[PDB]
């Protein structure tokens, strides 16, 4: 599986390492 | 001057196929590792191009149209084409654009040139000590309106033996009075007077002229050991721009590697 | 605008804030300076060749030098310090360097001191009408340099002459070097001077003992022409140095915007100036004077968030600048942004007030 005009990408609450622990 | 070349004979309108020629950078922008679409004037792929021969009487030198821009592809070794003419009347009546390459500096001017009936950029009286030295494309000119000179350089006007190993392709376009010019020079291994593959013609110079043009003429290099002159073996092609849409694949370094006609 | 807590109440339109995280404003770095670049302004036209010519042409045969295809630095009009009278019409001399033109001419001649007034737009006179007329729409300049010690000779310098008579006045910038005999009365002159017939040309009385009004003055008129055609000669453009790693504006030869300049490994061809991304937005540029490729990182910005417990608990509050590092600034950097007003701990607890990237906040002893 594969900007500056007020556009911004927020991150997720859970990181990929935290998903794997579940 | 007044008498045309007696060894001039018009060939029929022959033509061959142009696979992927006529590609050029439509702007001075850098883009890399992308694929950009654009709508401008280009050569439609796999289109026909008018062939022309130059040799002692198969010698073509007509006045062809320039309604929408044209192309050139000179299969040559001694640089048979040493210049061009551009304008509407191509005489001293209206303003006429002239381009000349004396192997040292490209001269560009716009004057009421009194061109000969069969203009040329040839030589004569080469009985001994030729050395590819010059020895009168227009009678006189005045009321000039533009002048420009390229940087110093050196062009190999000398003839060579064997298969053709040089190819020059150009584009001539009038962008709202700015007579933009593109160019490219690469080696070749000639097979049928027009090698195939892919390339891109970089811009050469911007010319803020602002003069309407509707026709043009090639200035072939003649020689003689105005009427009873001779010419060497050479040939070139002519194309015509058309408003087609194209894709432009840029590599990591920003060079156009391929294209697709929509 | 007192404290970030009050920005929350004005945001929610409530005098009481519940527990959670709330957005209030948008951080944005304003520009501090501005960069103005342009290619080199060398290759100047030699205006000193005319304003300080070793010898000047006569008045009835005034000489003209065409100026085209160069950078016309008009500062020589005043900085030369080699003139007695200097005046301009329409456009000031300090603004000519910013104005581009289609054609420019330098009309030079040597006239008497009293005749310097005749070099003016719409003015009539022996020199204005018969030798060199100016149009009413003249927007150029004129400089008269007293040459009493140079262009003078005892008994009269015969190399400088002018036209005193002519059957019809001349047009603006028109030259007439003919020797046709002028007719005054009803008699025919027969190509020779006689009764009511005079020669059209006359020599000047330039001598070293002449007064201020009769001495020779090297006059030069800088004529301008702004036609419909594209401009061919313009003056030098103003520019400054480069500012890097700072939020600044951009005014390049063919690029404008706002951002931060940094060195990069990109490369522009000799026939390329500025780049673009997939979204037609500029992200690179080559300097028109220096040989360098500089990426344009835009000025930082991001939404401002406040992290507060309930109003009934405490008014101590943290602040989060989403998507930016700690620049303006009890400080801690995260992968979501710079958090100020909170102390990091190596322990782990249940997430009460989320932030991002697994980080969470709470109010505890």
Coordinates of C-alpha atoms in Angstrom, one line a residue:
Chain A
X1 CA 0.0 0.0 0.0
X2 CA 1.5 3.3 -1.1
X3 CA -0.1 21.6 0.8
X4 CA 0.5 25.1 1.9
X5 CA -2.8 26.9 1.0
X6 CA -4.2 26.2 4.4
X7 CA -4.2 22.5 3.7
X8 CA -2.8 20.4 6.6
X9 CA -2.8 16.7 7.4
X10 CA -3.3 15.9 11.1
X11 CA -1.8 12.7 12.5
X12 CA -3.8 9.9 14.0
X13 CA -4.3 9.3 17.7
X14 CA -2.9 5.8 17.5
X15 CA 0.4 5.1 15.8
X16 CA 1.1 2.0 13.8
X17 CA 3.2 0.6 16.6
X18 CA 0.3 1.0 19.1
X19 CA -2.1 -0.8 16.7
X20 CA 0.2 -3.8 16.6
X21 CA 0.2 -4.0 20.4
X22 CA -3.6 -4.4 20.3
Chain B
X1 CA 21.2 38.1 -58.8
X2 CA 18.4 38.5 -61.4
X3 CA 18.8 35.1 -63.1
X4 CA 17.7 32.1 -61.2
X5 CA 19.8 29.0 -60.7
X6 CA 19.7 27.0 -64.0
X7 CA 20.4 23.8 -62.1
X8 CA 17.2 24.2 -60.1
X9 CA 14.5 21.6 -60.6
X10 CA 11.4 21.2 -58.3
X11 CA 10.8 17.8 -56.9
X12 CA 7.3 16.3 -56.4
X13 CA 5.7 16.6 -52.9
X14 CA 7.4 13.5 -51.5
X15 CA 7.1 12.7 -47.8
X16 CA 7.9 10.1 -45.1
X17 CA 6.7 9.4 -41.6
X18 CA 7.9 11.2 -38.4
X19 CA 7.4 9.0 -35.4
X20 CA 8.1 11.1 -32.3
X21 CA 9.7 14.2 -33.6
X22 CA 8.7 17.8 -33.0
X23 CA 8.8 17.7 -29.2
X24 CA 10.0 20.8 -27.3
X25 CA 9.9 22.4 -23.9
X26 CA 6.9 24.8 -24.1
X27 CA 8.2 26.8 -21.1
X28 CA 11.3 27.5 -19.0
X29 CA 9.9 25.6 -16.0
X30 CA 11.6 22.7 -14.2
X31 CA 9.5 19.6 -13.3
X32 CA 11.0 16.2 -12.4
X33 CA 9.6 12.7 -11.8
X34 CA 6.1 13.9 -13.0
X35 CA 3.8 13.7 -16.0
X36 CA 2.4 17.1 -17.1
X37 CA -0.3 17.7 -19.7
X38 CA -0.3 20.8 -21.9
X39 CA -2.2 22.2 -24.9
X40 CA 0.0 24.1 -27.3
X41 CA 1.2 23.8 -30.9
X42 CA 3.3 20.7 -31.6
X43 CA 3.9 18.1 -34.4
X44 CA 1.3 15.3 -34.4
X45 CA 3.1 12.0 -34.0
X46 CA 3.3 9.7 -36.9
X47 CA 2.5 12.5 -39.3
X48 CA 3.9 13.3 -42.8
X49 CA 6.8 15.7 -43.4
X50 CA 7.7 17.2 -46.7
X51 CA 11.0 15.9 -48.0
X52 CA 13.4 18.1 -50.0
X53 CA 16.6 17.2 -51.9
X54 CA 19.6 19.4 -52.7
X55 CA 22.1 18.2 -55.3
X56 CA 23.5 19.2 -58.7
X57 CA 19.4 19.3 -61.2
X58 CA 17.6 18.0 -58.1
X59 CA 17.8 21.2 -56.2
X60 CA 14.7 22.4 -54.2
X61 CA 14.4 26.0 -52.9
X62 CA 10.8 27.1 -52.9
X63 CA 9.0 29.8 -50.8
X64 CA 6.8 27.7 -48.4
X65 CA 4.1 28.9 -46.1
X66 CA 4.4 29.9 -42.4
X67 CA 0.8 30.2 -41.4
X68 CA 1.1 28.3 -38.2
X69 CA 4.9 27.6 -37.7
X70 CA 7.0 24.9 -39.3
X71 CA 9.8 22.4 -38.5
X72 CA 13.2 21.5 -40.0
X73 CA 15.4 18.4 -39.9
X74 CA 18.6 18.8 -41.9
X75 CA 20.4 15.7 -43.0
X76 CA 23.7 17.3 -43.8
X77 CA 27.5 17.2 -43.2
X78 CA 28.7 20.6 -44.6
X79 CA 25.7 22.6 -43.1
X80 CA 24.0 23.1 -46.5
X81 CA 21.4 25.4 -44.8
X82 CA 23.3 28.6 -43.7
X83 CA 20.3 30.7 -43.0
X84 CA 16.6 31.4 -43.6
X85 CA 14.2 34.1 -44.7
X86 CA 10.9 35.0 -43.0
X87 CA 8.2 37.5 -43.9
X88 CA 5.1 38.1 -45.9
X89 CA 6.4 39.5 -49.3
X90 CA 10.0 38.4 -48.8
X91 CA 11.3 41.5 -50.7
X92 CA 11.9 45.2 -50.1
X93 CA 8.2 46.0 -50.2
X94 CA 7.4 45.0 -46.5
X95 CA 9.6 44.2 -43.6
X96 CA 11.5 41.0 -44.1
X97 CA 13.2 38.9 -41.4
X98 CA 16.6 37.5 -42.3
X99 CA 18.8 35.0 -40.5
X100 CA 22.4 34.1 -41.5
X101 CA 25.1 31.8 -40.1
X102 CA 28.6 32.7 -41.1
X103 CA 30.1 29.9 -38.9
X104 CA 31.1 32.5 -36.3
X105 CA 28.0 34.5 -35.2
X106 CA 24.3 34.2 -36.1
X107 CA 23.2 37.5 -37.6
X108 CA 19.5 38.4 -37.3
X109 CA 18.0 41.6 -38.8
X110 CA 14.7 43.0 -40.0
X111 CA 15.0 45.4 -43.0
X112 CA 13.5 46.1 -46.4
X113 CA 15.9 43.5 -47.9
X114 CA 16.2 43.6 -51.7
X115 CA 16.5 39.8 -52.0
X116 CA 17.6 38.2 -55.2
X117 CA 15.1 36.3 -57.3
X118 CA 16.9 33.1 -56.3
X119 CA 18.7 34.0 -53.0
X120 CA 21.5 31.9 -51.7
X121 CA 24.5 31.8 -49.3
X122 CA 26.9 30.0 -51.6
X123 CA 30.4 30.6 -53.1
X124 CA 32.1 30.6 -56.5
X125 CA 35.5 30.9 -58.2
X126 CA 36.9 28.0 -56.3
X127 CA 39.5 27.1 -58.9
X128 CA 42.2 26.4 -56.3
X129 CA 42.7 27.0 -52.5
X130 CA 39.1 26.4 -51.6
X131 CA 39.6 25.9 -47.8
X132 CA 35.8 26.2 -47.5
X133 CA 36.2 30.0 -47.5
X134 CA 33.5 32.4 -48.5
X135 CA 33.9 34.2 -51.9
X136 CA 25.3 38.3 -51.7
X137 CA 21.9 37.0 -50.7
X138 CA 20.4 40.5 -51.0
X139 CA 21.3 43.5 -53.1
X140 CA 20.7 46.2 -50.5
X141 CA 18.6 47.0 -47.4
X142 CA 17.5 50.0 -45.4
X143 CA 14.9 51.2 -42.8
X144 CA 15.9 48.4 -40.5
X145 CA 13.9 47.8 -37.3
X146 CA 15.7 44.9 -35.5
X147 CA 19.3 43.7 -35.0
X148 CA 20.7 40.8 -33.0
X149 CA 23.9 38.8 -32.9
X150 CA 24.4 35.4 -31.1
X151 CA 27.4 34.6 -29.1
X152 CA 30.7 33.6 -30.7
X153 CA 30.9 29.9 -31.8
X154 CA 32.3 27.7 -34.5
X155 CA 30.3 25.6 -37.0
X156 CA 31.8 22.7 -39.1
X157 CA 30.9 23.8 -42.6
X158 CA 33.5 21.3 -44.0
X159 CA 32.3 18.3 -46.0
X160 CA 33.0 14.8 -44.7
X161 CA 32.9 11.4 -46.4
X162 CA 30.8 8.4 -45.5
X163 CA 27.4 8.0 -43.8
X164 CA 25.7 11.1 -42.3
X165 CA 26.7 11.4 -38.6
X166 CA 25.0 14.8 -37.7
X167 CA 21.4 15.9 -37.5
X168 CA 20.0 19.3 -36.6
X169 CA 16.3 19.9 -35.8
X170 CA 14.7 23.3 -35.2
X171 CA 11.3 24.9 -34.5
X172 CA 10.2 28.4 -35.7
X173 CA 7.2 29.9 -33.9
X174 CA 5.7 33.4 -33.6
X175 CA 4.3 33.7 -30.1
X176 CA 2.4 37.0 -30.1
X177 CA 5.2 38.8 -32.0
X178 CA 7.9 37.0 -30.1
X179 CA 9.6 34.8 -32.7
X180 CA 10.7 32.0 -30.4
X181 CA 13.2 29.5 -31.8
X182 CA 14.1 26.0 -30.6
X183 CA 17.0 23.8 -31.6
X184 CA 18.9 20.5 -31.0
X185 CA 22.0 18.9 -32.5
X186 CA 22.8 15.2 -31.9
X187 CA 24.8 12.5 -33.7
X188 CA 23.0 9.9 -35.9
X189 CA 23.6 6.7 -37.8
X190 CA 21.6 7.5 -40.9
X191 CA 19.5 4.6 -42.5
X192 CA 16.7 6.2 -44.5
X193 CA 17.4 10.0 -44.3
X194 CA 15.5 10.3 -41.1
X195 CA 16.6 8.3 -38.0
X196 CA 13.9 7.5 -35.4
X197 CA 13.9 7.5 -31.6
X198 CA 13.1 10.4 -29.3
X199 CA 14.5 13.8 -28.3
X200 CA 13.5 17.2 -27.1
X201 CA 14.4 20.6 -28.7
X202 CA 15.6 23.2 -26.2
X203 CA 14.8 26.9 -26.6
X204 CA 17.6 28.9 -28.4
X205 CA 16.6 32.6 -28.3
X206 CA 13.6 34.9 -27.8
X207 CA 13.2 37.5 -30.5
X208 CA 10.8 40.4 -29.7
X209 CA 10.2 41.3 -33.3
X210 CA 6.4 41.8 -33.6
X211 CA 6.2 41.4 -37.4
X212 CA 3.6 39.2 -39.2
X213 CA 5.0 36.3 -41.1
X214 CA 3.2 34.1 -43.6
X215 CA 5.9 32.4 -45.7
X216 CA 9.6 31.5 -45.5
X217 CA 12.5 30.3 -47.6
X218 CA 15.6 28.2 -47.1
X219 CA 19.1 29.5 -47.9
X220 CA 21.1 26.6 -49.2
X221 CA 24.9 26.6 -49.6
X222 CA 26.0 26.6 -53.2
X223 CA 29.5 26.2 -54.7
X224 CA 31.3 26.4 -58.0
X225 CA 34.8 25.6 -59.1
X226 CA 24.6 33.1 -59.7
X227 CA 22.9 31.1 -62.5
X228 CA 25.5 28.4 -63.4
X229 CA 26.4 27.5 -59.9
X230 CA 26.4 24.0 -58.4
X231 CA 25.5 22.4 -55.0
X232 CA 26.6 19.4 -53.0
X233 CA 24.6 16.4 -51.9
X234 CA 22.2 17.1 -49.0
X235 CA 18.6 16.9 -47.9
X236 CA 16.2 18.1 -45.2
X237 CA 12.6 17.9 -44.1
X238 CA 9.7 20.3 -43.3
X239 CA 6.9 19.9 -40.8
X240 CA 3.9 22.0 -39.6
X241 CA 2.8 22.7 -36.0
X242 CA -0.7 21.9 -35.0
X243 CA -2.8 22.6 -31.9
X244 CA -2.6 19.2 -30.2
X245 CA -2.6 18.1 -26.6
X246 CA 0.4 16.2 -25.2
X247 CA 1.8 14.5 -22.1
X248 CA 5.4 15.2 -21.1
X249 CA 7.2 12.6 -19.0
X250 CA 10.0 14.3 -17.0
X251 CA 12.8 12.3 -15.5
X252 CA 14.5 13.0 -12.1
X253 CA 16.8 15.4 -13.9
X254 CA 14.0 17.3 -15.6
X255 CA 14.6 16.0 -19.2
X256 CA 11.7 15.0 -21.4
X257 CA 12.1 11.2 -22.1
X258 CA 8.7 10.4 -23.7
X259 CA 5.5 11.9 -24.9
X260 CA 1.9 10.9 -25.9
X261 CA -0.4 12.5 -28.4
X262 CA -3.9 12.7 -27.1
Chain C
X1 CA -6.9 38.5 23.6
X2 CA -5.7 38.5 27.3
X3 CA -4.8 34.8 27.7
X4 CA -5.4 31.7 25.6
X5 CA -8.1 30.6 28.1
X6 CA -10.1 33.7 27.2
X7 CA -9.7 32.9 23.4
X8 CA -11.5 29.7 24.2
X9 CA -14.5 31.3 25.8
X10 CA -14.8 33.8 22.9
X11 CA -14.5 30.8 20.5
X12 CA -17.2 28.6 22.1
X13 CA -19.3 31.7 23.0
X14 CA -19.5 30.4 26.6
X15 CA -18.2 31.7 30.0
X16 CA -17.5 28.1 31.1
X17 CA -15.1 25.6 29.4
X18 CA -15.5 21.8 29.8
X19 CA -12.6 19.3 29.7
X20 CA -11.1 18.5 26.4
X21 CA -9.1 20.1 23.6
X22 CA -10.2 23.1 21.6
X23 CA -9.0 25.1 18.6
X24 CA -8.9 28.9 18.9
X25 CA -6.9 30.5 16.1
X26 CA -4.2 29.9 13.4
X27 CA -0.5 30.5 13.9
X28 CA 1.2 32.2 10.9
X29 CA 4.8 33.6 10.6
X30 CA 4.5 37.0 9.1
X31 CA 7.3 38.3 6.8
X32 CA 10.1 40.3 8.3
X33 CA 12.0 41.4 5.1
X34 CA 11.7 41.2 1.3
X35 CA 14.1 40.1 -1.4
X36 CA 14.3 41.8 -4.8
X37 CA 16.6 40.2 -7.5
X38 CA 17.2 40.9 -11.2
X39 CA 19.9 39.9 -13.6
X40 CA 23.1 42.0 -13.8
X41 CA 22.7 45.6 -15.0
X42 CA 26.1 45.8 -16.8
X43 CA 26.5 46.5 -20.5
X44 CA 25.6 50.2 -20.2
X45 CA 25.2 52.4 -23.3
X46 CA 27.9 55.2 -23.6
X47 CA 25.9 58.3 -22.8
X48 CA 29.2 60.1 -22.0
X49 CA 30.2 59.8 -25.7
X50 CA 27.5 62.4 -26.4
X51 CA 27.2 64.4 -23.2
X52 CA 31.0 64.7 -23.2
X53 CA 31.8 64.4 -26.9
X54 CA 35.2 65.7 -27.9
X55 CA 33.5 67.6 -30.8
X56 CA 29.9 68.5 -31.4
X57 CA 28.0 68.7 -34.7
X58 CA 26.7 72.0 -36.0
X59 CA 23.2 73.3 -35.1
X60 CA 21.6 73.1 -38.6
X61 CA 23.2 69.6 -38.9
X62 CA 22.7 68.4 -35.3
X63 CA 23.9 64.9 -34.6
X64 CA 21.8 62.1 -33.2
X65 CA 22.9 58.9 -31.4
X66 CA 20.5 56.0 -31.2
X67 CA 20.3 54.1 -27.9
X68 CA 18.9 50.5 -28.0
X69 CA 19.6 47.0 -26.8
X70 CA 21.4 47.9 -23.5
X71 CA 20.8 49.1 -20.0
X72 CA 20.2 52.8 -20.0
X73 CA 21.5 54.2 -16.7
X74 CA 20.1 57.7 -16.6
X75 CA 22.1 58.7 -13.5
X76 CA 24.7 60.4 -15.6
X77 CA 22.3 63.3 -16.2
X78 CA 23.1 64.7 -12.7
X79 CA 26.0 62.6 -11.3
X80 CA 28.3 63.7 -14.1
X81 CA 28.7 67.2 -12.5
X82 CA 29.7 68.6 -15.9
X83 CA 26.8 70.9 -16.8
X84 CA 25.4 74.4 -16.1
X85 CA 21.7 73.8 -16.7
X86 CA 19.7 70.6 -16.3
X87 CA 15.9 70.3 -16.6
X88 CA 13.4 67.6 -17.4
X89 CA 9.7 67.5 -18.4
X90 CA 7.0 64.9 -17.7
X91 CA 9.2 62.2 -16.1
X92 CA 11.7 63.0 -13.3
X93 CA 15.3 61.9 -14.0
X94 CA 15.3 59.7 -10.9
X95 CA 12.4 57.6 -12.3
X96 CA 13.8 57.1 -15.9
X97 CA 15.9 54.2 -14.6
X98 CA 12.7 52.3 -13.7
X99 CA 10.8 53.2 -17.0
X100 CA 11.4 51.1 -20.1
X101 CA 11.2 52.6 -23.6
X102 CA 11.1 51.5 -27.2
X103 CA 13.7 54.0 -28.5
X104 CA 15.9 56.7 -27.1
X105 CA 18.0 59.4 -28.9
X106 CA 20.7 61.9 -27.9
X107 CA 20.3 65.1 -29.9
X108 CA 23.5 67.2 -29.4
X109 CA 24.3 70.7 -30.6
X110 CA 26.1 73.8 -29.6
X111 CA 24.0 77.0 -29.3
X112 CA 24.3 80.4 -27.7
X113 CA 23.4 81.0 -24.1
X114 CA 20.3 83.0 -24.9
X115 CA 19.3 80.2 -27.3
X116 CA 19.3 77.6 -24.5
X117 CA 15.8 78.8 -23.6
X118 CA 14.6 77.9 -27.2
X119 CA 15.2 74.2 -26.4
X120 CA 11.8 73.6 -24.8
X121 CA 8.5 72.0 -25.8
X122 CA 6.1 74.2 -27.7
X123 CA 8.6 77.1 -27.7
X124 CA 9.2 79.1 -30.9
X125 CA 12.4 80.9 -32.0
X126 CA 15.3 81.0 -34.5
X127 CA 16.6 77.6 -33.2
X128 CA 13.3 76.0 -32.3
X129 CA 11.6 76.6 -35.7
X130 CA 14.4 76.4 -38.2
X131 CA 17.0 74.2 -36.5
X132 CA 15.5 71.8 -33.9
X133 CA 11.8 71.8 -32.9
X134 CA 10.5 69.9 -29.9
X135 CA 6.9 68.5 -29.6
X136 CA 4.4 69.5 -27.0
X137 CA 4.5 65.9 -25.7
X138 CA 8.2 65.9 -25.0
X139 CA 8.9 63.9 -21.9
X140 CA 12.7 63.9 -21.9
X141 CA 15.5 66.0 -20.6
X142 CA 17.9 68.7 -21.7
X143 CA 21.4 69.5 -20.4
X144 CA 23.4 72.6 -21.4
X145 CA 27.1 72.6 -20.6
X146 CA 29.0 75.9 -21.0
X147 CA 31.9 75.3 -23.4
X148 CA 33.3 78.8 -23.6
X149 CA 36.8 77.5 -23.2
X150 CA 36.4 74.6 -25.6
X151 CA 34.1 75.4 -28.5
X152 CA 35.2 79.1 -28.9
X153 CA 37.6 80.9 -31.2
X154 CA 38.7 84.5 -31.6
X155 CA 36.8 86.1 -34.4
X156 CA 34.1 83.4 -34.4
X157 CA 34.3 79.6 -34.6
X158 CA 33.3 78.8 -38.2
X159 CA 32.9 75.1 -37.5
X160 CA 29.6 75.7 -35.6
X161 CA 26.8 77.2 -37.7
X162 CA 23.0 77.3 -37.7
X163 CA 20.0 78.0 -39.9
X164 CA 18.6 81.6 -39.7
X165 CA 16.1 81.5 -42.5
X166 CA 13.8 78.9 -44.1
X167 CA 10.7 79.0 -46.2
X168 CA 8.8 76.8 -43.7
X169 CA 9.3 75.8 -40.1
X170 CA 10.5 72.3 -39.3
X171 CA 8.7 69.5 -37.6
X172 CA 9.6 68.0 -34.2
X173 CA 13.0 66.3 -34.4
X174 CA 13.3 67.2 -38.1
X175 CA 16.7 68.0 -39.6
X176 CA 17.2 70.2 -42.7
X177 CA 20.8 70.6 -44.1
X178 CA 19.8 72.2 -47.4
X179 CA 21.3 75.4 -48.8
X180 CA 18.1 76.7 -50.6
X181 CA 18.1 80.5 -50.9
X182 CA 15.3 82.0 -48.8
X183 CA 12.9 84.5 -50.5
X184 CA 11.8 87.6 -48.6
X185 CA 10.1 89.8 -51.2
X186 CA 8.3 89.3 -54.5
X187 CA 11.5 89.2 -56.5
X188 CA 13.1 85.9 -57.6
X189 CA 16.4 85.2 -56.0
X190 CA 17.7 83.1 -59.0
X191 CA 19.6 80.8 -56.7
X192 CA 21.9 83.7 -55.6
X193 CA 21.7 86.3 -52.8
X194 CA 20.5 89.8 -53.7
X195 CA 17.6 92.2 -53.2
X196 CA 15.4 90.7 -50.5
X197 CA 17.3 87.4 -50.6
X198 CA 19.4 86.0 -47.8
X199 CA 21.6 82.9 -47.2
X200 CA 19.8 80.4 -44.9
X201 CA 22.8 79.4 -42.9
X202 CA 24.9 81.7 -40.6
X203 CA 28.0 81.1 -38.5
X204 CA 28.0 81.8 -34.7
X205 CA 30.0 84.6 -33.0
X206 CA 31.5 82.2 -30.4
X207 CA 34.5 83.9 -28.9
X208 CA 36.3 83.6 -25.5
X209 CA 35.3 87.2 -24.6
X210 CA 31.6 86.6 -25.1
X211 CA 29.1 87.1 -22.3
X212 CA 27.0 84.5 -20.5
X213 CA 24.2 84.8 -23.0
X214 CA 26.4 84.7 -26.1
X215 CA 29.0 82.0 -25.2
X216 CA 28.7 78.5 -26.6
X217 CA 26.7 75.9 -24.6
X218 CA 27.0 72.2 -25.4
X219 CA 23.3 71.3 -25.4
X220 CA 22.1 67.6 -25.4
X221 CA 18.5 66.6 -25.6
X222 CA 17.7 63.1 -24.4
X223 CA 14.5 62.2 -26.4
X224 CA 12.3 59.3 -25.4
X225 CA 9.7 57.3 -27.5
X226 CA 7.1 55.0 -25.9
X227 CA 5.5 53.3 -28.9
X228 CA 3.1 50.4 -29.1
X229 CA 6.1 48.1 -30.0
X230 CA 7.8 46.1 -27.3
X231 CA 10.4 47.9 -25.3
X232 CA 14.0 47.5 -26.4
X233 CA 16.0 49.5 -23.9
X234 CA 15.3 50.0 -20.2
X235 CA 17.1 51.3 -17.1
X236 CA 18.8 49.4 -14.3
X237 CA 16.5 47.7 -11.9
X238 CA 16.9 48.0 -8.1
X239 CA 17.9 44.9 -6.2
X240 CA 19.4 43.8 -2.9
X241 CA 21.1 40.8 -1.2
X242 CA 19.7 37.4 -0.4
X243 CA 18.0 36.4 2.9
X244 CA 17.9 32.7 3.8
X245 CA 16.3 30.7 6.7
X246 CA 13.8 33.6 7.2
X247 CA 10.2 34.2 6.2
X248 CA 10.5 36.8 3.5
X249 CA 8.7 38.0 0.4
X250 CA 9.9 37.3 -3.2
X251 CA 10.2 39.7 -6.1
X252 CA 12.3 37.9 -8.8
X253 CA 12.7 38.6 -12.5
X254 CA 9.8 36.3 -13.2
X255 CA 8.7 34.9 -9.9
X256 CA 6.9 36.3 -6.8
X257 CA 5.5 35.0 -3.6
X258 CA 6.4 34.5 0.1
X259 CA 8.6 31.8 1.7
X260 CA 12.0 30.7 3.0
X261 CA 15.1 30.1 0.8
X262 CA 17.4 27.2 1.4
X263 CA 20.2 25.5 -0.4
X264 CA 19.3 22.3 -2.2
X265 CA 20.6 19.6 -4.6
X266 CA 18.1 20.5 -7.4
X267 CA 19.4 21.8 -10.7
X268 CA 18.0 24.2 -13.2
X269 CA 19.0 24.1 -16.9
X270 CA 20.6 27.2 -18.5
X271 CA 17.2 28.0 -20.1
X272 CA 15.2 27.5 -16.8
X273 CA 14.5 30.0 -14.0
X274 CA 11.9 28.5 -11.6
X275 CA 10.4 25.1 -10.9
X276 CA 6.9 23.8 -10.0
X277 CA 5.4 20.9 -8.1
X278 CA 2.6 18.6 -9.2
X279 CA 0.0 21.3 -8.2
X280 CA 1.6 24.1 -10.4
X281 CA 3.0 25.7 -7.2
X282 CA 6.6 26.9 -7.1
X283 CA 9.1 25.1 -4.9
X284 CA 12.5 26.1 -6.4
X285 CA 14.3 29.0 -8.2
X286 CA 17.7 29.9 -9.6
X287 CA 19.2 33.3 -8.7
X288 CA 19.4 35.7 -11.7
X289 CA 22.8 37.0 -10.6
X290 CA 24.5 34.2 -8.8
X291 CA 24.8 30.5 -9.9
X292 CA 22.8 28.7 -7.3
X293 CA 19.6 26.7 -6.9
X294 CA 17.4 27.5 -3.9
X295 CA 14.3 25.7 -2.8
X296 CA 11.4 27.9 -1.5
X297 CA 10.0 26.5 1.7
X298 CA 7.0 28.6 2.6
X299 CA 6.5 30.4 5.9
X300 CA 5.3 28.1 8.8
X301 CA 1.7 28.1 9.9
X302 CA -0.7 25.8 11.7
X303 CA -3.8 25.7 13.8
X304 CA -3.6 26.7 17.5
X305 CA -5.1 24.4 20.1
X306 CA -5.5 24.8 23.9
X307 CA -5.4 21.9 26.3
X308 CA -7.4 22.7 29.5
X309 CA -9.2 20.8 32.2
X310 CA -12.7 21.9 33.2
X311 CA -13.1 25.5 34.3
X312 CA -14.4 24.3 37.7
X313 CA -11.0 22.5 38.2
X314 CA -8.2 25.0 37.3
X315 CA -7.3 27.8 34.9
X316 CA -3.8 26.5 34.2
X317 CA -3.7 25.7 30.5
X318 CA -1.3 24.5 27.9
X319 CA -1.1 25.5 24.2
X320 CA -0.3 23.5 21.1
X321 CA 0.8 24.7 17.7
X322 CA -0.2 22.0 15.3
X323 CA 2.3 21.1 12.6
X324 CA 5.2 23.4 13.6
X325 CA 8.4 23.2 15.6
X326 CA 9.2 25.4 18.6
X327 CA 10.2 28.8 17.1
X328 CA 8.6 31.6 19.0
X329 CA 9.3 30.1 22.5
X330 CA 7.9 24.4 29.9
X331 CA 8.4 23.5 26.3
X332 CA 8.2 20.0 24.7
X333 CA 8.4 19.0 21.0
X334 CA 6.1 16.3 19.6
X335 CA 5.5 14.8 16.2
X336 CA 2.2 16.8 16.0
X337 CA 3.6 20.2 17.1
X338 CA 5.3 22.2 19.8
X339 CA 3.5 21.9 23.1
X340 CA 4.0 24.6 25.7
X341 CA 2.7 24.6 29.2
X342 CA 3.0 20.9 30.0
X343 CA 5.7 18.8 31.7
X344 CA 6.6 15.4 30.1
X345 CA 6.8 12.3 32.3
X346 CA 8.4 8.9 31.7
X347 CA 5.3 7.2 33.2
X348 CA 2.2 6.1 31.3
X349 CA -1.5 6.5 32.2
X350 CA -4.9 6.4 30.7
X351 CA -5.5 9.0 28.0
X352 CA -7.7 11.8 29.3
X353 CA -7.2 14.7 26.9
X354 CA -5.8 13.5 23.5
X355 CA -3.2 15.4 21.6
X356 CA -1.8 13.3 18.7
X357 CA 0.8 10.7 17.9
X358 CA -0.1 8.7 21.0
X359 CA 0.6 11.7 23.3
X360 CA -2.1 12.6 25.8
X361 CA -2.6 15.2 28.5
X362 CA -4.1 15.4 32.0
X363 CA -4.2 17.5 35.2
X364 CA -2.7 15.6 38.2
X365 CA -0.7 16.4 41.3

